[PDB]
Each structure stands twice: as C-alpha cells, then as structure tokens.
Design a protein around this ligand. Structure first.
Ligand SMILES: [Mg+2]
Lengths: 50, 100, 79, 321, 147, 235
C-alpha cells in the first residue's frame, strides 16, 4: 500500500533517493533513505539543566 | 498536523477540554482572538429567554509545568458550525486534531 | 603543550613520586621565583615542569641538590 | 554590512621542503569548506603540468613479459616511470631515451640530458638492473596534459590506434601528489565560530607547493573573471537629481495618518492629493465646516510633523496629472 | 586594579575578558564525571576548549567507557584549582593515561559502531567497480584517484 | 588547446516564474562544472544582501504575548507573517514603513504606505485579518539591509532601544535565496567534446535579481580568492 501510494506521486518506489553532499557537493553513493518524520521537543530543555 | 497519524488524534483533541467545543450548533457571529460569539440556530435555540453563545478563549497563561497554554480561533465569520465541532484550537492542536 | 606522560613514567620510578617532584618544580617556578631551564611556548608552570623533567635534567635528587645549594648561598650571604 | 572578512595566514610550514602545511584564519562560518573543496577539485584534475605518457621497450612489447636483465616485472617499471616527475619548456611533447647498461640500478640521472626538459630528482631510482649481461633500453614520451588520466581513458586511447603495440603508463599531469583540507573553529573577540582552514599538500617536487597553491588560485580567479562585479566597484559615481516638488505631494491626503472624520472633511473641499493641500493656507480651513479643534489639531500635527508645513506657494503642480 | 573593576568587567563580559579566559584554560584541565560512578573511569581529566553553546561536547571514544549515551545524559565538571591537582589530573586522571581498563587488560578505547561501520565499508571489497585491476604507486595516489 | 583554456559567460537569466529563475553558465572545459556549482550554491546559501524586517511597532499591543480586539490572528502569527514578508530597498539601508488599515477584511502587504525606493515583491502576502467594522490597525515596521542572518536575541546592544514598550523585536531572517539547485550537462561547442554547461535553478524571495545576485556571489568568492592568492607570511 505504501509502495503504490508512493508510485501515485512521482516519488521513487524504493523510498531511497540519491543525495548530494552539502560541503563537497558530490553524490552520496548507496542511496540514502529520506522522508518526513513527526518529531517532538522533550521537556528537558538545556536552559534549565546547565 | 502530524502527517502519519492514527485517526485517534481526532478524538483526544475533542474528548478533552483543551479546545473550544460547540455546545450548540449555529452560525458564527463574531470571531476574535479573545472571544468567539456564535448565534444558535432556530431549532437548537431555547423557545424562551434564549440568545447567543459566547466562548471566552484563554490567552497565554502559566500552566502547571511552566508551559504556555493558548487557544487560537480556527473559524471564519458566517461559517456555520455543528454541535460538538471545534471552534478554537487549543495548545498543540490543529483543526480538532492533536498535534504535539 | 603535553599530551602523554608515559616517557616521564619511564624516567621516574613511578607516577606518585613523579607528580610530587613535578608539583615541587611548579611551586619553585610559579611562586618560588625560579627561571625555567627550558624555553616555554606559552605554557603553564605544570607543562614546562613536565618538559624539564622529561629532558632528564631535573628530578627529586637534583631538586634536593638545588635546595641545599640555595641554602648554602643564603648562609654564605649571611656571613 | 555587506562587507566580508579577509583571512590572514599565520603559518606556512615547509617541512621536508616538498610537503607544505598552510593555514588560513579567519574565514566565515561556511567559506572554509567551499574554499577547500574548490581548491582540492582544482588541484586534483584541473591543474596543467607534465608527466610520462608513453613508454616503449626495445625488446618488450607487452605489459606482461618475463623480461630478463631486470629483477622487477614490467609493472614495477611502469610504476617507477609514473613516479618520475619532469618539467618541460614550451614544447608540449618530447621523447627521451634510456640507452644504458651496467651493474647497478638505472636511475633518473641516466636519462639523456636535454635542455628542453629538466628532471626533478636525478637520484630517483628507476629500475634495478642485473649485475651482468643486461643491456636494456627504453624510450619515454612525456606531454603537457591537464590532469590525471586513469587506465580507462588510457586503454581507450590505446584502442584508438595502437599500431606498434605501444606500451602505456598512467598519466598524472597534476604536479600535486596529495592534498587534504581540514576546517576547525577559530574565535574572534565575540564571534561564535569561524572556519580556520588547514591545507596539507604534497607535490611531485617539480614546483613549490605554495607556487601550486598560487597557480590554482590564479586559475580560479581567471575562471571567475567573467563576473567579478564587471569592475572593482562598478559604481564610482553618484548623482542626486531631485525636482522642487516632492513625490509625497502627488500622493493623496489619505496617506497622512488622519482619521475618517478628517479624511471626509478634506474630501469635502475636493482636495484629494497632498499637493492640492500644501498650496492652501490654514485660513481656508477653519472657515470650512466640520473643521473645529480636534480635526484641525490632528491635521496640523500629522501634516507638518513630516518636515513640510501647511500653506506654501509653488507652481509645479500637478506634474503630470 | 581592584576586584570590583574585574567583577564588573566580567559581568559586562567585554571584548577584553574573552582572551583572558582563553589564556587561563590554555593548559588548565578539568574533570568530567558521570552521575552513576562505577569504576575509576567514572571521573576523567580533559583539557577544555571553549565553545559557544550551553552543552558539553564530549569525545566519542570515551563515552563508551563512561557508559553514557547521548539521549539526554547530564554530566558534571569540576576544577582542580591547585598546581598539585592540575599536575595530577594531567598525569594520572588524563584520558590518555587511562586506555586499559583496571579490570581486564582489554583496551577500554575500543572503537564504537559508527567508526567501525565506516571502516568496514571502506575495506569490504567488491568484485567489480571503477578502476578494478589498475596499478597505484602509493596510498597518496590512491586517495587522489578516489577523491 | 591543452593549456590556456576559456572562461564561462552568462547567456540567459530566463525565469520560469516571478521568483523561480534559471541561469546557464557555459562553457566549462572539465571538472569546473561541479566545482563552480557547489561554490556558487554555498556562497548563495551562506549570505546574500537581504532586506527583511527587524523591528516592529504597533500602538495597540504592548508585547508579542498579548492580543487585540479586532484582529483574527495573534500577535505572534502577525510577527511570523511579517518575517515571511519580503521587500526591496534601493536608496537607504534602513527604512520605516507605516501600515494603516480599517474595516473587515484580509490586511495584506498592498495596504501599507509604500515609498519611493521601497518595493513590495508580492501584495497578495496576507498579514492579518480584521474581523470587526470599528477596528483599526496602525503599525510601524522597521526594515534594514544586512549580510547573513541574526536572531532577535544576540542583536541587542544597549538597554534603551527596548525601553519603548511598543517596540518589538523579530529575528532578522533575511535571505533572498531559498533553494539553489544546479546540474551540469553536455554543452554545445564549436569543435570538441566533453564540455559542461551548468544550469542553476533558484527559488528565491523574488526581491533580489538573479543576475545581480549571481554576480555579487561571484565577486564575493573572487574577493576571498584574491585574498588567498598572493599568499605570503604577513601578520
Ligand atoms: Mg541515557
């Protein structure tokens, strides 16, 4: 189901896209996976720990 | 809105008392960042001594964990709303859906 | 600068006497008013003391000899 | 401020006189990375020089051969030839011979000395020779190429004609052998972090490492010359042309921080533009109805606080409406 | 000239105090400590370098001995404050002087997952790739051809 | 030739939209393609002349954590929308704009009092929404030109600029460019092979000109270079 949903759009079916380095500007071999993840900022801010 | 949701988020945001729930479905009369005034429909309106409903949104106030809790209106003027629908997204909510 | 002290452990019998003689040298160099026998490179007293110990010209016996010599000089000046 | 920072080098270490360690400090938060990457990609491939490109042994016509007279295979011969640097003059292609026999190993000093070329290390050993009955000779052709040509393009150039069965060597026209740039944190009095660059390079010795650095920098500057501001500053000329009337006068009076009451009162006299109001003394205001104290005070405050005043004599109005 | 002026300058944090702070920590090590301390490696000595932030940057090859993951662990820092103390921290409690665990002769600076994965990928050879079968003079030429 | 090769030259600043633009560097001999692409990309993403908002002032609200009877969104959403707004100034380096609006409606960038050298890149950019007839908003917006990016915290210098309660500080996030992609392809040449033409696409704020920004980035890189070129032991 996820594969057919990805193929519905123009995104690659394998889920791993070729990535370019930000510093060297070259191609990363072994295509890295990349997506959209939902993340959370925990209630352990450093400004109350240092 | 969280992209990969579970469907349950559409309940935890409304079953709790964090967001502004519609006690009576009506037409929006006055939208403001502080208060929301709704005009009750003729059927749901009481046959006597009735009027319009007012929800006083709470602004930035200290919570029990030193966090901010604020409700933001998510409705437009003249937009008809149904009973039980969300009117103002509270903290960490989006259109009646939990968004942490 | 100084990153490792293994050569100092090779030159001295152990690490405790090594750090003791290094602390004595550092006290002599910082508040004792003694000049460093090795040209420093913007380093603290501890680093130059460890360097002079590693060069092999400063140890507990040499420090005791220098203390005896400064004592003799004090008494010769008192005459 | 649109004014960047220029680094000032504090260390050019020339250890072993053929391997340099240069520093650069300070840069900005991201300039060190890109500068190192550009310099490396330039010195690796796009750096003109000279190196061996063809080899031909008078008795061996294949890279695989049980050749006598030498205690090393043909692969080691080709490797030592690739490891031999030489600088040539304007002649971009020249052959040399190695007619020599003997007992010890043949080195770079045994090459036929020609004024058109110059060997960098005469003592560089080339091939160990058999102590007796070993008279081997080979010719070597060098050219002036662009950079590294691996065995793939080399075997393609072979596939082109290779009529005699000419042997081949890996051409490395880049004078630098290795280079590595490293970025670290450098601190100004209150700056968070700056890219302190450290470049450790090592060349074939045919040119100084600082000289190769300067040459790569000049070649990149020549490449970028096409769009270097079109000039130093491209604008050493300022010209201030201003008419007598101000452009604020052409704007309507509704853009002067005035209430709806004052706006309606000003529109009552058909005075829409500001220039239609600046040429009107206040004597023609208190006579106008609905212009008492609050309206008049607000007008005189929000009209003259902008520098101008109410009531002036001008003729250039309205240009051009 | 006095302590009050220096205190006011430190509170203001002028441009003239940061170089002093860099100079006083030129060779003055400190002590890093994990909250649960098990063995001698629970407290180590390190030369500090100043970084702009509110967090303590730690070497990756020692946290393994610290048994401290980077999921929110908080560690403490202490100052020697004495010549004897600084010399002892540089001589004994320093990280370089503690590479073998006191329990077993196994080196406690065994590499972690990231570096070993990188090296395994670097050394795991294939059968066919770009440049299979050619010849290289030295490691520097190999690095050049690769980059 | 084998040595003394050519130099590139701009030939097109064709824009597929009002902001999404494309440029074409050609020709490049070999290897210079990726080099120049990465260099220009990093220079553009690092720092370019930007003209975002720095300080705001609204007569009604005193602090960004307050509200105002008449506006739908909150003060924080207003500050976010203002930070998202882009503008172009030419003559001066800092300017103060005045926005005065009333009546029910979506208050956008087209409702502000523009000036001579002040140009709005897009008037459709919504700022807030007035949901009351007898409701008005009169605000002052400070916009200054800078280099790079600076937050609202570290920008403080003294303790008198914040004494006026109406003055609020937003993080000065000015960056004309937003995304910069590049790719090399086979260039069209007179008689040779393997020449790389570099197509660089840029999704920007529409404030800066693509050609102007490209030339400015090239000049910045060349200045850093020229500082690096005549290397000698000088302190
Ligand atoms: Mg943990």
């Amino acid at each position: 189901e996820i594969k057919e949903l990805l193929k519905l759009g123009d995104l690659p079916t394998s889920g791993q896209i070729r990535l370019y380095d930000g510093r060297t500007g070259e191609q990363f071999e072994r295509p890295v996976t990349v997506g959209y993840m939902y993340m959370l900022k925990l209630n352990h801010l450093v400004d109350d720990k240092m | 809105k969280p992209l990969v949701g579970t469907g349950m988020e559409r309940a935890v945001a409304v079953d709790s008392g964090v967001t502004a729930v519609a006690k009576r479905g009506g037409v929006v009369q006055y939208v403001d960042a502080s208060r929301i005034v709704i005009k009750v429909n003729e059927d749901e309106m009481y046959p006597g001594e009735a009027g319009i409903d007012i929800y006083n949104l709470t602004k930035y106030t200290r919570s029990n964990q030193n966090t901010c809790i604020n409700q933001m209106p998510c409705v437009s003027l003249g937009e008809p709303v149904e009973r039980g629908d969300v009117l103002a997204d509270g903290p960490s909510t989006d259109l009646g859906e939990l968004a942490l | 600068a100084r990153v490792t002290v293994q050569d100092a452990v090779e030159k001295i019998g152990n690490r405790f006497d090594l750090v003791l003689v290094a602390a004595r040298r550092a006290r002599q160099m910082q508040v004792g008013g003694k000049d460093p026998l090795v040209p420093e490179e913007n380093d603290k007293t501890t680093v130059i003391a460890l360097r002079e110990i590693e060069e092999g010209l400063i140890n507990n016996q040499i420090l005791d000899v220098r203390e005896r010599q400064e004592q003799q000089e004090q008494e010769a000046a008192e005459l | 401020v649109t004014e960047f920072l220029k680094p000032r080098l504090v260390d050019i270490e020339q250890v072993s006189s053929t391997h340099a360690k240069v520093t650069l400090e300070p840069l900005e938060r991201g300039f060190g990375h890109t500068l190192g990457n550009a310099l490396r990609r330039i010195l690796l491939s796009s750096m003109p020089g000279c190196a061996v490109t063809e080899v031909e042994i008078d008795g061996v016509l294949h890279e695989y051969s049980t050749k006598e007279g030498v205690q090393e295979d043909i692969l080691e011969i080709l490797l030592n030839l690739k490891g031999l640097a030489v600088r040539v003059q304007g002649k971009d292609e020249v052959i040399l011979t190695l007619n020599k026999s003997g007992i010890g190993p043949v080195t770079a000093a045994d090459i036929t000395h020609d004024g058109d070329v110059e060997i960098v290390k005469p003592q560089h050993v080339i091939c160990h020779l058999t102590d007796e009955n070993a008279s081997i000779s080979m010719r070597i052709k060098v050219q002036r190429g662009r950079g590294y040509v691996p065995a793939s393009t080399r075997i393609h150039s072979e596939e082109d004609e290779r009529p005699i069965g000419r042997l081949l060597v890996d051409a490395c026209y880049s004078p630098v052998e290795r280079i590595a740039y490293n970025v670290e944190a450098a601190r100004v009095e209150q700056r968070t972090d700056l890219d302190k660059l450290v470049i450790e390079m090592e060349t074939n010795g045919t040119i100084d490492p600082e000289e190769a650095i300067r040459r790569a920098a000049t070649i990149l500057a020549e490449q970028l010359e096409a769009f270097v501001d079109l000039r130093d500053v491209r604008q050493p000329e300022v010209k201030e042309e201003k008419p007598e009337f101000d452009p604020i006068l052409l704007r309507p009076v509704d853009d002067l921080e005035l209430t709806v009451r004052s706006a309606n009162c000003l529109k009552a006299e058909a005075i829409h533009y500001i220039g239609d109001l600046v040429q009107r003394t206040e004597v023609e205001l208190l006579k106008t109805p609905n212009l008492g104290k609050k309206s008049l005070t607000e007008i005189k405050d929000v009209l003259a606080s902008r520098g101008l005043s109410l009531g002036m004599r001008l003729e250039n109005w309205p240009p051009a409406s | 000239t006095t302590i009050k002026a220096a205190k006011k300058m430190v509170e203001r944090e002028e441009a003239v105090v940061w170089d002093i702070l860099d100079e006083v920590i030129r060779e003055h090590p400190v002590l890093l400590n994990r909250a649960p301390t098990l063995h001698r490696l629970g407290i180590q000595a390190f030369e500090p370098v100043l970084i702009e932030g509110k967090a303590i940057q730690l070497h990756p090859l020692v946290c393994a001995a610290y048994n401290a993951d980077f999921d929110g662990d908080q560690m403490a820092v202490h100052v020697p404050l004495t010549l004897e103390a600084q010399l002892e921290a540089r001589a004994l409690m320093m990280s370089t002087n503690n590479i073998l665990s006191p329990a077993n002769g196994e080196p406690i600076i065994v590499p972690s997952q990231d570096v070993v994965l990188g090296l395994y990928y670097m050394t795991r050879d294939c059968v066919n790739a770009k440049g299979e079968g050619m010849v290289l003079t030295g490691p520097k030429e190999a690095e050049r051809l690769y980059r």
